[PDB]
Design an enzyme around this catalytic site. Structure first.
Site, PDB file in Angstrom:
ATOM      1  N   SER A 236      22.936 -32.202 -10.790  1.00 44.82           N
ATOM      2  CA  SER A 236      22.297 -31.534 -11.922  1.00 44.82           C
ATOM      3  C   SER A 236      23.332 -31.201 -12.984  1.00 44.82           C
ATOM      4  O   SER A 236      24.522 -31.061 -12.697  1.00 44.82           O
ATOM      5  CB  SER A 236      21.594 -30.228 -11.512  1.00 44.82           C
ATOM      6  OG  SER A 236      20.524 -30.493 -10.631  1.00 44.82           O
TER       7      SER A 236
ATOM      8  N   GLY B 120      22.188 -31.780 -16.830  1.00 39.61           N
ATOM      9  CA  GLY B 120      21.771 -32.374 -18.098  1.00 39.61           C
ATOM     10  C   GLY B 120      21.743 -31.408 -19.265  1.00 39.61           C
ATOM     11  O   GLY B 120      21.612 -31.847 -20.415  1.00 39.61           O
ATOM     12  N   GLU B 121      21.861 -30.110 -19.000  1.00 36.56           N
ATOM     13  CA  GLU B 121      22.037 -29.122 -20.055  1.00 36.56           C
ATOM     14  C   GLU B 121      23.495 -28.683 -20.179  1.00 36.56           C
ATOM     15  O   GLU B 121      23.800 -27.785 -20.971  1.00 36.56           O
ATOM     16  CB  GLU B 121      21.118 -27.914 -19.810  1.00 36.56           C
ATOM     17  CG  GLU B 121      19.663 -28.117 -20.285  1.00 36.56           C
ATOM     18  CD  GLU B 121      18.923 -29.212 -19.511  1.00 36.56           C
ATOM     19  OE1 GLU B 121      18.728 -30.323 -20.065  1.00 36.56           O
ATOM     20  OE2 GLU B 121      18.518 -28.956 -18.352  1.00 36.56           O
TER      21      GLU B 121
ATOM     22  N   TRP C  57      18.115 -34.806 -10.267  1.00 36.37           N
ATOM     23  CA  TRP C  57      17.774 -33.607  -9.521  1.00 36.37           C
ATOM     24  C   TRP C  57      16.346 -33.633  -8.994  1.00 36.37           C
ATOM     25  O   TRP C  57      15.852 -32.597  -8.524  1.00 36.37           O
ATOM     26  CB  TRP C  57      18.010 -32.366 -10.392  1.00 36.37           C
ATOM     27  CG  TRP C  57      17.284 -32.393 -11.710  1.00 36.37           C
ATOM     28  CD1 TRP C  57      17.668 -33.044 -12.848  1.00 36.37           C
ATOM     29  CD2 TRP C  57      16.052 -31.720 -12.029  1.00 36.37           C
ATOM     30  NE1 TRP C  57      16.740 -32.845 -13.846  1.00 36.37           N
ATOM     31  CE2 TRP C  57      15.744 -32.027 -13.375  1.00 36.37           C
ATOM     32  CE3 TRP C  57      15.177 -30.900 -11.307  1.00 36.37           C
ATOM     33  CZ2 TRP C  57      14.596 -31.545 -14.016  1.00 36.37           C
ATOM     34  CZ3 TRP C  57      14.033 -30.406 -11.953  1.00 36.37           C
ATOM     35  CH2 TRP C  57      13.756 -30.739 -13.296  1.00 36.37           C
TER      36      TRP C  57
ATOM     37  N   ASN D  70      17.489 -36.080 -18.767  1.00 39.64           N
ATOM     38  CA  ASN D  70      17.630 -36.146 -20.210  1.00 39.64           C
ATOM     39  C   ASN D  70      19.045 -36.550 -20.608  1.00 39.64           C
ATOM     40  O   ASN D  70      20.008 -36.271 -19.881  1.00 39.64           O
ATOM     41  CB  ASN D  70      17.304 -34.795 -20.830  1.00 39.64           C
ATOM     42  CG  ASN D  70      18.251 -33.712 -20.363  1.00 39.64           C
ATOM     43  OD1 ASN D  70      18.200 -33.289 -19.204  1.00 39.64           O
ATOM     44  ND2 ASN D  70      19.136 -33.271 -21.249  1.00 39.64           N
TER      45      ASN D  70
ATOM     46  N   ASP E  65      13.763 -33.139 -24.082  1.00 42.52           N
ATOM     47  CA  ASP E  65      14.159 -32.812 -22.696  1.00 42.52           C
ATOM     48  C   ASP E  65      13.057 -33.125 -21.673  1.00 42.52           C
ATOM     49  O   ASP E  65      12.821 -32.358 -20.733  1.00 42.52           O
ATOM     50  CB  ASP E  65      14.620 -31.354 -22.546  1.00 42.52           C
ATOM     51  CG  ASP E  65      15.304 -31.099 -21.203  1.00 42.52           C
ATOM     52  OD1 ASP E  65      16.204 -31.881 -20.854  1.00 42.52           O
ATOM     53  OD2 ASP E  65      14.934 -30.153 -20.471  1.00 42.52           O
TER      54      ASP E  65
HETATM   55  O1  LIG Z   1      18.948 -31.690 -16.784  1.00 41.76           O
HETATM   56  C1  LIG Z   1      19.228 -31.173 -15.649  1.00 41.76           C
HETATM   57  O2  LIG Z   1      20.265 -31.526 -15.032  1.00 41.76           O
HETATM   58  C2  LIG Z   1      18.262 -30.221 -14.935  1.00 41.76           C
HETATM   59  C3  LIG Z   1      18.239 -29.608 -13.664  1.00 41.76           C
HETATM   60  C4  LIG Z   1      17.169 -28.829 -13.298  1.00 41.76           C
HETATM   61  C5  LIG Z   1      17.568 -28.352 -11.893  1.00 41.76           C
HETATM   62  O3  LIG Z   1      18.642 -28.730 -11.354  1.00 41.76           O
HETATM   63  O4  LIG Z   1      16.834 -27.514 -11.303  1.00 41.76           O
HETATM   64  C6  LIG Z   1      16.127 -28.652 -14.166  1.00 41.76           C
HETATM   65  C7  LIG Z   1      16.152 -29.278 -15.437  1.00 41.76           C
HETATM   66  N1  LIG Z   1      17.217 -30.045 -15.791  1.00 41.76           N
HETATM   67  C8  LIG Z   1      15.007 -29.111 -16.387  1.00 41.76           C
HETATM   68  O5  LIG Z   1      15.062 -29.661 -17.448  1.00 41.76           O
HETATM   69  C9  LIG Z   1      13.870 -28.299 -16.015  1.00 41.76           C
HETATM   70  O6  LIG Z   1      12.938 -28.129 -16.754  1.00 41.76           O
HETATM   71  C10 LIG Z   1      13.849 -27.626 -14.669  1.00 41.76           C
HETATM   72  C11 LIG Z   1      12.920 -26.830 -14.085  1.00 41.76           C
HETATM   73  C12 LIG Z   1      13.422 -26.495 -12.836  1.00 41.76           C
HETATM   74  C13 LIG Z   1      12.775 -25.680 -11.739  1.00 41.76           C
HETATM   75  O7  LIG Z   1      13.235 -25.853 -10.572  1.00 41.76           O
HETATM   76  O8  LIG Z   1      11.753 -24.984 -11.963  1.00 41.76           O
HETATM   77  N2  LIG Z   1      14.641 -27.097 -12.649  1.00 41.76           N
HETATM   78  C14 LIG Z   1      14.932 -27.792 -13.779  1.00 41.76           C
HETATM   79 LA   LIG Z   2      16.997 -31.174 -18.315  1.00 38.71          LA
END
Ligand SMILES: O=C(O)c1cc(C(=O)O)c2c(n1)C(=O)C(=O)c1cc(C(=O)O)[nH]c1-2
Ligand SMILES: [La+3]
Ligand code: NA
Length: 563
Positions: free
Chosen positions: A168, A170-171, A241, A259, A301
């Site tokens: 994980s 992407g942010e 992820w 993303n 995203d």
């Molecule tokens: O771009 C990423 O690497 C990454 C990881 C995760 C994560 O690891 O839980 C989420 C997201 N993005 C994401 O965009 C998102 O909306 C999200 C929701 C959740 C959740 O578990 O409710 N994880 C994540």
């Molecule tokens: La994301």
């Protein structure tokens, strides 16, 4: 892994995250059915002793129940006779380094089993193998670097003699990969990046294919870096992820990539391949068989990481081996899972408006310029885009019933305002660049017309041979749990108010509900113990007015018919 495959053919087990390698989350157990599920009761419960989001679900193998938690990811092995802990493992993790780089709560999607071991992918990216009978650590490997913004939240998958895990971030400008570790030693066997040169991605220019101009064609040279400006792919996202599926006859692992890093699209021109893509990889070597980009040059995203369910179904009068995927972007995709041919791509929530349709010749969504955040520009608010970034479906995995031929979607019914702005990368810091606000879609899920509603969720039955909604039930909050379909004709799922619900698989009518202690963001799983079918779900709200309905929690509730 043929041992895991054998375990999944016994309906008494729930031996992988998805029940079977195909990821359909369907159980052949039918002791609980449409006639008697109104008589279901909580049988027993178990507190995990940990707060914040409880994603994933129980993994049951040869009568032993294994459960996991959010950070610090304590694992419990539970004896169903005594309902007591056989062993527990709590990793030592640096909270001050790991928590700040978790974008979306301290969740963990669960465990894998294989070769007499339990596999736990820790938040701090250490992948750990535990002896399934004693809980003692056999090996561990650091799969990432939290100093660069990398974390792990997803479940590993045992495949042949390997353990498959992703990343994980992407942010946080992390370049995504899928990695395979030797199941016995933990040594890295192969690593497939989502972008970069062919030695990183394991793409073969003449053998890896994609959908282009209406046919399956070789991807060619520099398929990734020619869609990025300069070196931006080095921090370009496409993380991994979500959930992994596996076809043992083809020896292919399927998954999605997230993303393309920064949320400001004008800053990163190009298709940004292979972010936002579906993949089939050779399980032995990692070599990409095919890849398909759902959302070129993402502006919202809409992480492409949601599960890829493998089902054989009739399309246009022919039995096809398909892959089905309900993306964050609101389109439900059906592909040939052998060749990667694009078969169906239709909206599974008709509020979706960022694209008019997916062009079946080019395979590309046709962006509707009013809802394009790049078109409106940096520091300009794009208003009323559907779906919100958190998607029409997020992590919560679907189920499939062969009895009905329908997929069951735990859906979000949420739109957003989205304003991008230019940002700069600093390792270990967020790399986002947008301001968002969300609100109910306010439009009928089936017709797309304004309806005066304020529901934030939908539970939706979908026919993937034609790409059509069969029925959909409004839910006041987004539906964040993985459903379960069974041969008893029932579908189970959990709500953010904490209800475990059962509905008729054919019609969607409610047959049962019970209020567990906290909002459910985990998966409803089912198994058989001493001849009785049990249904288990974790409660503990997290991930992503609700706060007056649920507080933080962390418990397991096991349901069964009374004796
Ligand atoms: O771009 C990423 O690497 C990454 C990881 C995760 C994560 O690891 O839980 C989420 C997201 N993005 C994401 O965009 C998102 O909306 C999200 C929701 C959740 C959740 O578990 O409710 N994880 C994540
Ligand atoms: La994301
Ligand atoms: Na290439």
């Amino acid at each position: 892994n043929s041992e895991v495959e054998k375990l999944t053919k016994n309906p008494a087990n729930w031996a992988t995250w998805g029940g079977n390698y195909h990821g359909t989350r369907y159980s052949e157990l039918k002791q609980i059915n449409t006639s008697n599920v109104k008589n279901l009761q909580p049988a027993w419960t178990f507190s995990t002793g940990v707060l914040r989001g409880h994603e994933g679900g129980p993994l049951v193998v040869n009568d032993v129940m294994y459960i996991h938690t959010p950070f610090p990811n304590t694992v419990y092995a539970i004896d169903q006779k005594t309902q007591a802990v056989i062993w527990e493992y709590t990793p030592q993790q640096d909270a001050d380094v790991t928590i700040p780089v978790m974008c979306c709560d301290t969740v963990n999607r669960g465990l894998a089993y294989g070769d007499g071991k339990i596999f736990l992918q820790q938040s701090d990216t250490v992948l750990t193998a535990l002896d399934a009978k004693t809980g003692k650590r056999v090996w561990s490997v650091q799969n990432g670097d939290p100093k660069l913004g990398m974390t792990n939240t997803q479940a590993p998958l045992v495949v042949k003699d390997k353990v498959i895990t992703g990343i994980s971030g992407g942010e946080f400008g992390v370049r995504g990969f899928l990695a395979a570790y030797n199941i016995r030693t933990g040594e890295l066997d192969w690593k497939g990046y989502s972008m970069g040169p062919d030695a990183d991605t394991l793409i073969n220019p003449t053998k890896t294919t994609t959908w282009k101009d209406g046919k399956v064609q070789p991807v060619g040279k520099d398929s990734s870096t020619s869609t990025w400006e300069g070196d931006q792919w080095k921090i370009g996202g496409g993380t991994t992820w979500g959930w992994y599926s596996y076809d043992p006859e083809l020896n292919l692992v399927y998954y999605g990539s997230g993303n393309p890093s920064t949320w400001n699209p004008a800053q990163r021109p190009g298709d940004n391949k292979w972010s936002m893509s579906l993949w089939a990889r050779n399980a032995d070597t990692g070599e990409v068989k095919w890849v398909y980009q759902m959302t070129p040059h993402d502006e919202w995203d809409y992480d492409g990481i949601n599960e890829v369910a493998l089902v054989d179904q009739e399309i246009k009068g022919q039995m096809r081996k398909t892959a089905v995927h309900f993306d964050r972007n609101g389109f439900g995709y059906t592909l040939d899972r052998v060749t990667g041919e694009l078969l169906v791509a239709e909206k599974f929530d008709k509020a979706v408006n960022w694209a008019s349709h997916v062009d079946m010749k080019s395979g590309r969504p046709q962006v509707v310029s009013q809802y394009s955040t790049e078109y409106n520009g940096e520091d300009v608010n794009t208003e009323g885009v559907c779906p919100a970034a958190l998607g029409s479906k997020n992590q919560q995995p679907v189920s499939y019933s062969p009895q009905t031929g329908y997929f069951y979607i735990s859906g979000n019914h949420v739109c957003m305002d989205y304003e991008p702005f230019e940002v700069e990368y600093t390792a270990g810091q967020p790399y986002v660049g947008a301001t968002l606000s969300m609100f109910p879609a306010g439009k009928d899920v089936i017709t797309g017309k304004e309806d005066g509603s304020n529901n934030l969720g939908q539970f939706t039955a979908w026919d993937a041979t034609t790409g059509k909604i069969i029925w959909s039930n409004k839910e006041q909050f987004s539906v964040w749990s993985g459903s379960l379909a069974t041969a008893g004709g029932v579908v189970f799922y959990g709500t953010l108010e904490g209800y475990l619900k059962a509905v008729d698989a054919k019609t969607g009518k409610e047959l049962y509900r019970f209020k567990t202690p906290s909002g459910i963001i985990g998966n409803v799983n089912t198994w058989e113990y001493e001849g009785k079918q049990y249904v288990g779900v974790l409660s503990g709200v997290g991930g992503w007015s609700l706060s007056s309905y649920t507080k933080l929690g962390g418990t397991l509730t096991v349901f069964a018919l009374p004796n």
